[PDB]
Design a protein around this ligand. Structure first.
Ligand SMILES: *[C@@H]1O[C@H](CO)[C@@H](O)[C@H](O)[C@H]1NC(C)=O
Ligand SMILES: [Ca+2]
Ligand SMILES: [Ca+2]
Ligand SMILES: [Ca+2]
Lengths: 48, 265
């Protein structure tokens, strides 16, 4: 809200000071991904 | 008593046939049966061993000369079979999916193998004759082979990428491998749960007697695909119960022991 105004009990994030003093917002977790990465294992190397 | 040597023996053809050593060999020898758990399960009796012993006592075998030694399954039996008696009998159930394993068991016990050890991390091994095979025991053996050429390089495989090796076994409790005799092989094996031994098949063991209980005769002892023999101590029976089988064995225990002969080594 904004004291001394008619804007009261509005729901949302105001863009005036979003960080609110914090150095950074952090979120932890894991994640798995598929890829088509290249390899031989171990062919195309010299015969010896 | 010249042991460690082999000398010419001699005799004649005028000497008469001596007495029957039966009724004495039974007394100064021992008989060990190897039955499957299914037999005692079907039976559901606690005194069947004393019963068969009192029955043997009529044939001549005394009370404490007979031994029974159970085994849950053919593979658990194949896992380090330790047959230490003077006359061994082995009753073997038939299963078309277990054919190769119950033939390897036969090729392992019916014969007498001279077994040297093996270390895969250091050496690369080759076979010399057609009877120098590799027998692997354990709980789950996964054996892969990569043959090598004259200049120590693989043939359709690479000496680093074990996945390119050629697979001959996959989680088998007993394996008997023959490969091309004249080529060095690099091996991958589950050393932790399996021991492999390089063994030479010597002359046969005349001390055991396998008795297939069910299906037709399939056991190809000789690895070579030309003989497919049926030895004298390779017996067959057709079954619907087990008491009939044990009574048959007891009634014809003399023919069995005539087919068997006390060991040499
Ligand atoms: C050999 O067998 C015959 C016939 O039973 C018997 O009379 C003889 O006593 C036996 N020999 C010996 C040394 O007991
Ligand atoms: Ca097998
Ligand atoms: Ca061979
Ligand atoms: Ca390959």
């Amino acid at each position: 809200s904004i004291t001394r105004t008619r804007v009261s009990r509005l729901y949302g994030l105001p863009a005036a000071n979003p960080n609110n003093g914090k150095e950074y917002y952090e979120v932890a977790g894991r994640f798995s991904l598929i890829s088509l990465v290249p390899s031989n294992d171990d062919y195309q190397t010299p015969i010896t | 008593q010249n042991y460690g040597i082999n000398l010419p023996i001699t005799g004649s053809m005028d000497t008469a046939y001596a007495n029957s050593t039966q009724e004495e060999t039974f007394l100064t020898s021992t008989l060990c049966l190897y039955y499957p758990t299914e037999a005692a399960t079907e039976i559901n009796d606690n005194s069947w061993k004393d019963t068969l012993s009192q029955l043997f006592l009529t044939k001549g075998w005394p009370t404490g000369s007979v031994y029974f030694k159970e085994y849950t399954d053919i593979a658990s039996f194949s896992v380090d079979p330790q047959l230490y008696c003077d006359y061994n009998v082995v009753l073997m159930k038939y299963d078309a999916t277990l054919q190769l394993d119950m033939s390897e068991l036969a090729d392992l016990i019916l014969n007498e193998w001279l077994c040297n050890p093996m270390d895969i991390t250091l050496y690369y091994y080759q076979q010399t004759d057609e009877a120098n095979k590799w027998i692997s025991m354990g709980s789950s053996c996964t054996i892969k082979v990569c043959p090598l050429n004259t200049q120590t390089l693989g043939i359709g495989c690479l000496t680093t990428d074990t996945a390119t090796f050629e697979e001959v076994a996959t989680a088998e409790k007993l394996v008997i491998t023959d490969v091309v005799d004249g080529v060095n092989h690099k091996l991958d094996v589950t050393t932790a749960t399996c021991t492999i031994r390089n063994c030479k098949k010597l002359g046969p063991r005349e001390n055991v007697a396998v008795i297939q209980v069910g299906g037709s005769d399939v056991l190809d002892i000789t690895a070579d695909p030309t003989t497919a023999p049926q030895t004298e101590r390779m017996m067959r029976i057709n079954w619907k119960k087990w008491w009939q089988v044990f009574y048959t064995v007891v009634d014809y225990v003399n023919q069995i022991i005539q087919a068997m002969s006390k060991r040499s080594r």
